[PDB]
């Protein structure tokens, strides 16, 4: 439930969290980079 003060204009309620998104830059080779990309709670697959 979200209750606020009256708004004059159609203003956005910018709702966030403290959600984690961590990336490891993997590299087994000199020349190419593996991008281990994952938003942790919001499944990328």
């Amino acid at each position: 439930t979200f209750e606020v003060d009256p708004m004059d204009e159609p203003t956005l309620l910018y709702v966030l969290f403290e959600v984690f998104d961590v990336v490891r830059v993997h590299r087994p080779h000199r020349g190419v980079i593996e991008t281990v990309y994952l938003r942790t709670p919001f499944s990328a697959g």
Partner: peptide
């Protein structure tokens, strides 16, 4: 070669 599980698996070409 990649990040997780490196293993040899070959077929004849």
């Amino acid at each position: 070669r990649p990040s997780f599980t490196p293993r040899q698996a070959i077929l004849t070409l």
